[PDB]
Every structure is written in C-alpha cells, then in structure tokens.
Design a protein around this ligand. Structure first.
Ligand SMILES: [Mg+2]
Ligand SMILES: [Mg+2]
Ligand SMILES: [Mg+2]
Ligand SMILES: [Mg+2]
Ligand SMILES: [Mg+2]
Ligand SMILES: [Mg+2]
Ligand SMILES: [Mg+2]
Ligand SMILES: [Mg+2]
Ligand SMILES: [Mg+2]
Ligand SMILES: [Mg+2]
Ligand SMILES: [Mg+2]
Ligand SMILES: [Mg+2]
Ligand SMILES: [Mg+2]
Lengths: 206, 143, 67, 141, 65, 101, 63, 313
RNA sequence: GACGGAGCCAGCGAGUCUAACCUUGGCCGAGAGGUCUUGGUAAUCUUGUGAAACUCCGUCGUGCUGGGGAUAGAGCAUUGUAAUUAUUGCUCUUCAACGAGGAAUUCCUAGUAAGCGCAAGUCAUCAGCUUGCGUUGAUUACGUCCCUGCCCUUUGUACACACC
RNA sequence: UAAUUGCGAUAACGAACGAGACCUUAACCUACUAAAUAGUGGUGCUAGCAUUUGCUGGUUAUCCACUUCUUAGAGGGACUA
C-alpha cells in the first residue's frame, strides 16, 4: 500500500482510500450505471466528486447545470425555503447523513439509489397551456430529459420538506425514506404520486 | 516529535483542559457564578453549571496563547453574541466584563497570564509550559 | 452585439485605403502600426480599429470587395 | 540556501499566502496542520490537491500558509489554490516540464478551475432596492 | 461625455427684471485644435497622415564608399 | 544634517504627480539615500444625497466623490537645501507640509 | 406499456402562446426513415433521447 | 527530408527557434504564449524532443531568442520593451536590459560573447555590453527596423566585428562598431522587408520581404548578385551552414533553395486536417542545427516540427 | 429549529483645537454603565472593527412548547436645562395573537435572488429607515408577444383639451 | 444590431445631436517604480516542547534582503483573437 509518514499525521484511512479510488467520503463512484435510457448525458455520474460543495459556474450558459454532477443538484434543491437559503454546508451534512441512512437501510450504493429514484420519478408526460377561447385549455406535451431530471429532484426535495415540516423525523430520515420508496415505486413517495397525477391528467387532457 | 496547542484540536483540548482545571480546583471563582447570563445578549444561564467557568478559563488561556496581548474588551467582543431585541432585528452586544475579568485575574493568581506593557495581558512561562504539556497528553491520548 | 460603428468602419477603411503595403495580416503587428501611423486617443478604440482592419485584410486576400 | 517560492490564492476576499520550500514534507495552515482546519466537511476540499497528484510529490516539501480576509468558505477555497499553485510554481521552477504538465492535465481534468481564480465579484448595490438587482416592492394603490 | 466635461463651459445667470427672474443658460464648446493642455481632439477623430511613394524598378544597384 | 519628512497631498492626480516628480527629481540630482516616494491608499470622500430639492419624484440618489491623494518622502538634508526644496517646489492645489521628526 | 424511445434530429421552432413549447423533428431509434414532429415542454438540443407512450398525435401550432 | 515527429508544448505562434553549438542536443523556442521553453531532444518516432525547462518573466509577447555558442547565456527580446539574459540551468535572470522606447525586434551576441546588439521599434539600434552599459545608440532608419544580425570577421579574432540590419523604409545598413560609424547601405527592395541572415563565413547577406524576391549581397566586394521570387509572403530565412543552402519559411509552407548551382530544392508541404483551404496555417520560424543536419520549423497551430537532411533516395 | 457552551472569519468607512470626537488598557459593577489613564488630526490608534448567519458538542422535544415576545408592573443607569403621554439601555416578573395566510399582487436570470450582520446619514440621546459594504449563496428561462406596455411601418378614423 | 447599430438599396447628397465612443469602478499582471504609516524571509536576543537538525511563538532602534500577498502611479492586456 506504501504509506508515507510525516510529522503531520494525514490519517491512514483517507490516505489509502482516496489514493486508491477517487471516492465520495467513503463510497465507490464506479460500477454505477443508469438503469434506463433517455436520462444519460444529463444525470452526471461519470466524473467523481469528493464533497458536493463546489464553486462551479453553472448558470452562465445554457446546459452547464446538465454538466454539473447530480449530488450537488440534490444539495442545491435541499437548500430552499427562506429559513435555509444560504446554508449549503448544512445541506451537505444532511445529504451525507441521508446517504448514510440509505446505506443502513439497504446495502446497495446510495448514488445508485439516487439515480434510480430520479429515473423512476421523472414525469414522462406533462401538460401545457393553450389559449383556447372559453375554458382555456391544456394539451399534453412530452418532457425534455433535463426537465425530467429537474422536476424529479424538485419533487423529491418538496416531498421531504412537507413530510418533515412538523415531525419528530429529521430531514435526513425523510429524504432517505422518500429516496428508498422512489427507487422502488410503491405508491408511497410524494414524488411518484405527483408523477402519477401528472401522467393521469395528461392522458385525460390529451 | 514536536507538540503545540496549534497542533492539537480545539474542542478536545478545551474539554481536557477544563477537566484538568476541575481536577486541580484552584480557581477562586466569584460568588455570583450561578447568577449571571455571561452576556446581556443572552436570556438563559449556562447549562453545565459545574464547569462553565472552567471551560471559559480554558478558552481564555488558549486565546492568550494564540494572541500577543488582549484585554477584557477584546474578550467581551469575542464572547458576545446576537441580542434578541424582540420584534427588532438582532445586534452584536458584548459579553459580561465582570466574569471575563474574574477569570482573567483568576488565571493571573494561578500564574498563567500576566500584565503586558502598552497595556494588556500575555501568556506566562509556566502557563505556556502547562498548556504545552496538556497539549501533549491530548496528542498521545491515542491507545 | 459586436456590430462595429461608423467611426471604426470609416477609420479602418481610410487606413486600408492609403496604407495597404505596410499593413500586415496579424492583429498585434497591425495595432502597433495603427499606434504609430494614427494619432488615436483611445486604447480600446485603437484595438477596435486594428481588429476591423485585420478583418478587411483577410477579406481582401480572399477576394475583391466593393467598399 | 532556503529554495523557497511565494504563491497566493484568492476567492472573493480571502488572500492565502503560501511559502513553499524544500524540506521534510510538512503542510501547515496558520501554524497548524491541514488535518485541523475547521470548515468540518471541507477537510476533503483542502486535501483535494495533496490527494489528486499524490502524497509522494509532497514528501519533500514544507508549505506554510498565512491567511487573511473573507469568511470560512473563502478561507478554505483559497488554501486549495495556494497548496496547488504553490505546487505548480515549485514544479515549474525546480523540476521537469513533463511532471508539471501532467499535473496541469490532472488539475484541468478534475478542476473547479483550481489554478485559476473565480472572476465572479460582488456587484455594487443600487438605490431603490436593498439588493444589487432586486428593488423595493411598489404598490400602485 | 467626459468630452463635455473637458471642452464645454456652462454658465447660469439670474437676471432680475420688473417681472420674475429670467434664467440665462450660456453654453460654449471650445475648439480642440487650439488647446494648450490636455487632449487636442475629440475621442472620435482618426486623422490619417498621407504617405509618400517611390518608383518600384529603381535599377537595382549598390553604392561604394 | 537633519533627517526630516515631507508629506504632500491634493485632490488633482496629475498636478500631484508632477509635484512628486519634481520632488523626486531634485532629490535624485542631490541624492541623500535614494528615497523613492511611498504611495498611500487614496482616501475617497463619499457624500451621498438626494437629487430632488423638494421631496417629489422617483427616489434617485447621487454620490459625489472627492479623492485625496497623499504621498511622503524622507529627506536627510542640511538647512538651506531643505529650504530651497520647500520654497521652489510649489503648485496650486497641492498642500505640502514638512516635519522635522 | 408501449414506451417509445425517440431521438431528435432537428429543432423546428418555439411555438406556444407564452413561448415555451418547442417543435422538434425526431426519429424513433429503430427506423431511420420513420420521423415525426413533436411538441416538447422542456429545453431540447440535438442528439437527445425522449420518451413517448403515444407516438401518433401529430400536433401543430398552439394558441 | 521527411517528418521526424511533431513537437508540442506552446500556446502561441512560435516566433523564434535556436540551438547551441557547444551542446547540440538542446533547443530553445520563443512563442506567443509569453514563455520561452528549452527542450532536450531524444529522437523518438513522434516526440522528437521533451521540454525540460520553461522560462517566464515577460509582460508581453516574446519575439526573438539568441544563444551563445556553448549554451550558457540566452537573450530574449520581447514586446514589453524588454531584453533579458538567462542561463540554462536553474532559470534565473542574469540581467535585464531596459531603455528601448518600444518593442524590441532582434538581439545578437558576438562570437567572443562580449557585445550584445538590439534593433527595435523606436527606429533605432542600441548596442550594449554584457554588464548593462549602453555602449552606443544608432539611428538612420526612418521606419520600423526589421532585424539585425551580427557578422564575424576573419580568423584569430581580428580587431573588428561587423553588423547588418534591415529596416522597413526599404533600407539595409551594414555597420562597423570599432568607432561607431556607417560603412554600407543597400537599396533595391520593391516592398516591405522582414528577414535577413548572414553567411557562416561572414560575407554573404540574404534578405527577404513581402512579395517573394530574395536578394543576396556580398560585403567583401560589396556587390549585389540576384533576386528570386517565392510567389508568397516569406517570413523566416535561414542558412544551412556546412551544406550551404537557403531555407525560407513562407506563408504557404517551406521553400528550401540551393546556391551551388541555382536550382529549387523543395517546396515543403506539411499534411494538415480539419481545416478549410482558405485557413491554411502558415509558417513563422526556422532554425538550423549546429552542424546543420536539422531544420526546426515553428508553425501557427502552436506546433514546432523537424525535418532532417537525408539523401533524396 | 430554540437555547447553552465552545470554534471562529469580513469589507465600505468615520473620528477632537480652542474642541471636547473614536476610544484601547487597568479597576468597580449581574447588567446597562461608571472611574483612572492611554493612542489617534489618522494605511500608523480606536480596529485583525475577533460582526452575524454559520461549525462542533450538549439540553429540549411536536406540546401555542424551552416557538413567539406583543401588552403590562416594579426597579437600576445614561443623554439632556428639562424625559410626565414610558428618549433610550439594562434587570426581574407578566407571556397576547400567530398553527404558512382568501380575492389579489411585488421583485428577480447570477456571485443574481434570498438569508446574515456591519459602517455612514440624519444624531445631545433615539433605527424596525435609507445609502453603501462585505459573509453564506439556490432553483428555474436562455424564450414569447397570451396579459401589461414600448419602438417602427402600413392602414382606418366623425379624435386634436387627441379613446379618460 | 442592445441601438436610424451597420450591410445595402436609393431624388437625394453632405452633415449634426443622441446611441456608441468617453469617464469611474470591479476583475489579470510572481513584468517597472517603490515602501518600519503594508507586509514577507533570514539574522541576532528570548519562551515552550522535542531534543537530532526542528515546530509554534515574541521582540523596536537587533540589523540585512525582497515586493509574492497590500497599496498606489506609469503601462500592458481583449479586438469577440
Ligand atoms: Mg459565542
Ligand atoms: Mg432573522
Ligand atoms: Mg442582499
Ligand atoms: Mg448557537
Ligand atoms: Mg480588515
Ligand atoms: Mg424564546
Ligand atoms: Mg446611526
Ligand atoms: Mg425623537
Ligand atoms: Mg427617515
Ligand atoms: Mg373605417
Ligand atoms: Mg376637432
Ligand atoms: Mg369610451
Ligand atoms: Mg525573529
């Protein structure tokens, strides 16, 4: 393994793991694949990241948010409501705790759980607005894959917010159970419930 | 192979130095330690009543080591916080100068800090020595 | 956008009209030329003059223009 | 003697001055080890350079960073630059161009620009609003 | 612009008559060519000096010294 | 042979600059050590007030700025040379003060 | 379910009264010569993969 | 003369290339990426040379680099009105010449490494010593002086060194520096002039400009020989010393010509891809080796490359 | 998330002469504050303005509750000639509505919104205001003329104080 | 085109104001000039621990050296290359 010992410690755990494979805190970034098509090249899980806090410019041009890795997008969507607009260091801790709870509930990769949740809650068919003199109509329209991913992350975080507003359960637990049920759609996630109502209203209004 | 309070962590070292000052006990605390709020910007007294003054002593001793010379005004500015003025917005209000000076002169009468010219209080010989030795035992606390 | 105005267009046209053999195809050399044979009072304006002059040089090498 | 170089790292207001010299191989910020900086979860953000390139290339370097200005995140993102640019400057001035270059390839392959700083600066505030772009709420009635 | 701050001089004068006071605004733009300090032209003029010409063939030869 | 300090300040940058150029020039043909001038941070006198004389109209504010530029040079010169510098170098607007210590 | 994986070729124009629905020319990833127009709600580039459950609406300009 | 592999490492037009007579395994490249990179050659199928040292310290584009013979003193002339003298190892500035009022065009050291000469954009040529004393100022050119090139005199280091220079008012001046006056002037150029060079023996000048004619002059008899169109913008000029040829980097590629007798040798074409026919990357710089087996050509795609003299078949 | 400890980081600026300004440091005081000195006409001294939000460890625990701090009573200080319809500051006690807000409607495309404090202005005292500054820093467009309007052209007009 | 901004067309030609240009500020300069009223490194004196070189500090008349960070002034840089 060849450790190099200095008077500064540089502990062996971070030494070995992050010299061998470019991880999360301690999580493998390889062997994760997007289980379905039509979300590749947007769900950015090919370039690894240590910690979701990056000073990356993504809102300058048109699709640098698509180039951005997905875990930072999960933190940035965990960020909303006016009490917590700014505290993304806190959002990173919540996300680390959430993925720890994911590991405890299921032995599989938490980033794979996040990918499966986004894949299974992307709303395939939305409904847009038409002038339509009289009852001011709505017409069913498909969804671009970036809008799929964005609405998926927004649904996950809004569900966690409203299900852990006034409860004993913390944001990390609520986000973890929502991510588990969105990974296995069991008609229990608020994200998949909003997906299902979007699909049924689209197939009614088409 | 080379030990300093800069080289040891803050929270751990502060807990261990508070425990050492508890085990020694020669601090001659004032009588109103249970009364105070430690600042006018507080509304509740400190929870750990048996060791809050000694934790303050540990923090102040570490501060005097880290800096050249500071006074009760600098300590009050540091240990102050945000005052809840009701419906009005928060402000920064300084801490309790009485307990700050009581813990300063208590560290003096131990022999950890002394009077430094151009005004001020600076770390002592045996104060730098015993802060460095307890920094050692916190470094080699590993099993 | 990056539409160039009558000042830079008129000036660059006059320079390329009466200084064709001396002026080059490179922006750096061409702006040193503009600095030396024009008493322009603005640095950014001088850079704009030289840039449009280089554009006209490339178009002249490509083919004959009407202007 | 003392073959040292001085580099800097800036974010929005933080200036981190890194003294990089040939020594035993220690890495310290404000007279304290890197393993003791307090952004809590950004301990890995500091390690990012040291880690990426490899501890080996630091097993002969003493770097000491003095830090001024800007809040805690500004502080840490500045260390990152200094312990990476001081690195790049040292490999420029003393060792092989292929080594410095492949370090540049790794840095720009993974980069949050690292070696270059962010050009984003706080724009000035305008009258009629508490923010720089947002204006006061008007009523019409 | 700063050309107005550089070249233009403005004056305002209140004139009292038997009615209400009259306001005289006088504005004078100085020429740039007879200035003694500062810029000698507006920041728009690109004055281009004319070149001189030489015969091309020249009967290519050398000179002895 | 007395070691004194000369400190100049003004609001107009260019006349301050050629005052300082005159001073450093004269010191350089009569060298004392070298003592190039030291340039202080520019003090921006900021005064913000309303545009409107009355209180009607859109709430538009304005910020007038004065700029104070200030330099110092150290000289270690005899009496008459200190004098001849201090009365020969003088221009409008630039205020120059000399201190013995 | 008849899920269909489409793949764009061309962007036609941004229809819709509010201007958010984009017209695209897509193929279907099994026949090259089978291409139709689609209304999309989100932002669309060239070379991306869309999802249909129904592929024969052949819609047009929205008012 | 085939391609011996491509050479990368720059981000600007490679303005100058040079070698060392004492150590023939070294290259120096000055480019428009504001740095001067010295390379050690290896002879690999592709990477002929590996960069070993990079030199910085300019605030604008560097144009020319010149070395002493053994390879220990290196001058650069750069458009921030700077001249600077490095060593090769450990990369520190030995000295900086300042005093030029504008961009600097060309620098040359004499054969005994005592006299440094710099022609520059303020229509003038400074001549300096090694330590940094301005020995003299020389005028005469009404326009941009293009380049200067030293000329060594006869054997046993005779008590004279000559110099030639070209300036963009159709003028070529040959000077002697024993007591600083003018000795020869050359006229005849149709157009703009950019590049000349002097023979290794030290009696021939070849000079070149905008419209493709090459003139050659001789100082021993002080007479003109001829002129030769290259049909394009010729940029750089070099002498193959032992084999005695004329390499000319031009706006379309390389034209290498022969002197004994007068015949064209090669219109050298590099293969390119991805570019249209109206945006062909032209040439910038040429250099010959110490014994002239190798010419290095620096090109506008930030790319240097090398072709070695070999039998035709 | 509130509280309690510890960790601990900015930038824009202002400041006294015939006046009494910004105040360090020492001491008294729970606190506000007081007193003895000191530095500064200022990149030097106040001031590293050791700011707050944050970070860590702990108490609490879905309870209008340790959330929230209005409305009240008593007392202690400071400014001022003078505080009574409390100038403000501090201490204890009192502990109300508020459980995320209907028709409507405002601002906003990146270091922007939003959160967070600080300085200056008015100032003897009094910021919940404004003007600036920095700290932390998202989402969602990269379009359209549907609503509200604007510019140009054509067209119609019984309008010209001009579609009110 | 942000722009009666330009290309062009053309009973119009040649101009003018405005826009733009300009000025201030925020960004870059390990290139210049510098600087105990900004710093940095070394040297002395001195304090701890380790002692084996070291690590963390303090020090105004301990000097010496430098300007990377800090300030400015003169410039350069982007002109869509
Ligand atoms: Mg606190
Ligand atoms: Mg609040
Ligand atoms: Mg704001
Ligand atoms: Mg707290
Ligand atoms: Mg500060
Ligand atoms: Mg409360
Ligand atoms: Mg106020
Ligand atoms: Mg009042
Ligand atoms: Mg008011
Ligand atoms: Mg009609
Ligand atoms: Mg009428
Ligand atoms: Mg009507
Ligand atoms: Mg010392």
């Amino acid at each position: 393994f060849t450790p190099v010992v200095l008077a500064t410690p540089i502990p062996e755990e971070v030494q070995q793991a992050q010299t061998e494979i470019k991880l999360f805190n301690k999580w493998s970034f390889e062997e994760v694949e997007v289980k379905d098509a039509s979300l590749v090249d947007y769900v950015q899980v090919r370039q690894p990241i240590f910690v979701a806090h990056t000073a990356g410019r993504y809102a300058n041009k048109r699709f640098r948010k698509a180039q951005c890795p997905i875990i930072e997008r999960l933190t940035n969507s965990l960020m909303m409501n006016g009490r917590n607009n700014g505290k993304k260091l806190k959002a990173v801790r919540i996300i680390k705790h959430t993925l720890d709870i994911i590991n405890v509930l299921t032995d599989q990769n938490p980033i794979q759980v996040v990918v499966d949740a986004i894949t299974n809650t992307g709303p395939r068919e939305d409904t847009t607005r038409v002038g339509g003199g009289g009852a001011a109509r709505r017409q069913a329209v498909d969804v671009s894959p970036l809008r799929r991913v964005n609405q998926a992350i927004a649904l996950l975080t809004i569900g966690a917010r409203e299900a852990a507003f006034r409860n004993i359960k913390t944001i990390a637990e609520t986000l973890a159970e929502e991510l588990i049920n969105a990974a296995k759609g069991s008609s229990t996630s608020y994200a998949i419930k909003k997906k299902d109502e979007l699909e049924r209203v689209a197939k009614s209004n088409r | 192979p080379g030990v300093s309070v800069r080289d040891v962590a803050a929270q751990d070292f502060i807990n261990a130095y508070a425990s050492f000052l508890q085990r020694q006990g020669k601090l001659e605390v004032p009588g109103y330690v249970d009364i105070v709020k430690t600042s006018s910007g507080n509304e509740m007294p400190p929870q750990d009543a048996e060791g809050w003054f000694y934790k303050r002593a540990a923090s102040v001793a570490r501060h005097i080591y880290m800096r050249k010379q500071v006074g009760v005004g600098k300590l009050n500015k540091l240990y102050g916080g945000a005052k809840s003025r009701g419906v009005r917005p928060y402000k920064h209000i300084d801490a309790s100068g009485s307990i700050n000076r009581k813990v300063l002169q208590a560290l003096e009468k131990i022999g950890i800090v002394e009077i430094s010219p151009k005004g001020g209080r600076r770390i002592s010989e045996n104060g730098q020595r015993d802060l460095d030795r307890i920094a050692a035992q916190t470094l080699e606390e590993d099993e | 956008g990056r539409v160039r105005t009558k000042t830079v267009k008129r000036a660059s046209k006059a320079l390329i009209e009466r200084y064709y053999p001396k002026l080059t195809l490179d922006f750096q050399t061409n702006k040193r030329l503009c600095d030396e044979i024009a008493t322009i009072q603005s640095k950014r304006l001088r850079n704009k003059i030289a840039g449009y002059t280089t554009h006209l040089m490339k178009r002249i090498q490509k083919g004959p223009v009407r202007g | 003697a003392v073959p040292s170089v001085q580099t800097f790292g800036k974010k929005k207001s933080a200036t981190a001055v890194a003294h990089v010299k040939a020594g035993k191989g220690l890495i310290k910020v404000n007279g304290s080890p890197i393993t003791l900086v307090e952004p809590e979860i950004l301990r890995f953000k500091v390690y990012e350079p040291l880690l990426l390139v490899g501890l080996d290339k630091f097993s002969n370097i003493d770097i000491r960073v003095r830090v001024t200005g800007g809040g805690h995140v500004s502080q840490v993102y500045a260390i990152r630059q200094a312990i990476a640019k001081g690195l790049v400057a040292y490999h420029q001035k003393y060792v092989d161009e292929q080594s410095k270059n492949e370090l540049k390839k790794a840095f720009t392959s993974y980069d949050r620009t690292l070696l270059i700083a962010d050009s984003r600066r706080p724009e000035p505030k305008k009258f009629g609003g508490k923010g720089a772009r947002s204006r006061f709420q008007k009523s019409y009635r | 612009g700063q050309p107005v701050n550089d070249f233009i001089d403005t004056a305002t004068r209140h004139v009292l008559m038997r009615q209400g006071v009259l306001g005289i605004k006088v504005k004078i733009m100085r020429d740039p060519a007879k200035s003694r300090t500062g810029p000698k032209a507006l920041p728009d003029a690109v004055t281009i000096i004319e070149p001189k010409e030489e015969e091309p063939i020249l009967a290519p030869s050398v000179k002895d010294y | 042979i007395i070691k004194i300090r000369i400190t100049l300040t003004s609001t107009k940058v260019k006349q301050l600059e050629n005052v300082s150029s005159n001073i450093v020039k004269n010191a350089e043909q009569h060298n004392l050590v070298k003592k190039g001038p030291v340039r202080l941070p520019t003090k921006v006198l900021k005064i913000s007030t309303r545009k409107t004389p009355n209180g009607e109209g859109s709430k538009t504010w304005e910020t007038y700025e004065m700029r104070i530029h200030k330099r110092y040079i150290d000289l270690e010169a005899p009496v008459q040379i200190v004098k001849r510098i201090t009365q020969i170098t003088i221009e409008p607007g630039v205020d120059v003060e000399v201190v013995v210590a | 379910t008849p899920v269909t994986l489409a793949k764009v070729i061309k962007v036609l124009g941004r229809t819709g009264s509010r201007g958010g629905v984009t017209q695209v020319r897509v193929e279907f990833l099994e026949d090259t010569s089978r291409t139709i127009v689609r209304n999309v709600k989100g932002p669309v580039r060239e070379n991306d993969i869309l999802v249909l459950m129904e592929s024969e609406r052949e819609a047009r300009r929205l008012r | 003369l085939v391609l011996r592999g491509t050479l990368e490492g720059h981000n600007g037009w490679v303005t100058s290339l040079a070698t060392s007579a004492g150590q023939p395994n070294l290259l120096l490249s000055a480019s428009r990426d504001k740095t001067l990179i010295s390379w050690k050659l290896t002879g690999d199928d592709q990477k002929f040379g590996v960069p070993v040292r990079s030199f910085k310290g300019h605030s604008h584009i560097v144009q020319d680099c010149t070395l002493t013979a053994d390879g220990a003193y290196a001058l650069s002339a750069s458009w921030d009105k700077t001249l600077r003298l490095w060593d090769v190892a450990t990369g520190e500035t030995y000295q900086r010449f300042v005093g030029h009022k504008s961009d600097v065009m060309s620098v040359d050291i004499d054969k005994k490494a005592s006299m440094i000469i710099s022609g520059s954009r303020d229509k003038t040529i400074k001549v300096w010593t090694i330590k940094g004393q301005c020995l003299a100022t020389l005028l005469g050119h009404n326009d941009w002086v293009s380049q200067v090139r030293v000329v060594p005199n006869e054997k046993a280091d005779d008590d004279s060194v000559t110099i030639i220079s070209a300036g963009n008012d159709k003028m070529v001046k040959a000077w002697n520096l024993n007591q600083f006056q003018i000795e020869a002037d050359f006229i005849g150029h149709n157009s703009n002039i950019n590049t000349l060079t002097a023979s290794p023996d030290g009696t021939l000048i070849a000079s070149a400009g905008k419209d493709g004619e090459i003139m050659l002059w001789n100082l021993a008899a002080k007479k003109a020989m001829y002129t030769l169109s290259a049909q394009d913008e010729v940029f750089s000029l070099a002498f193959s010393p032992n084999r005695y040829w004329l390499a000319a980097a031009t706006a379309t590629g390389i034209k290498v010509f022969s002197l004994d007798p007068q015949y064209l040798v090669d219109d050298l074409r590099p293969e390119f891809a991805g570019y249209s026919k109206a945006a062909e990357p032209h040439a910038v710089s040429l250099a010959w080796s110490a014994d002239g087996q190798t010419l290095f050509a620096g090109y506008t795609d930030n790319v240097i490359r090398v072709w070695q003299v070999m039998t035709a078949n």
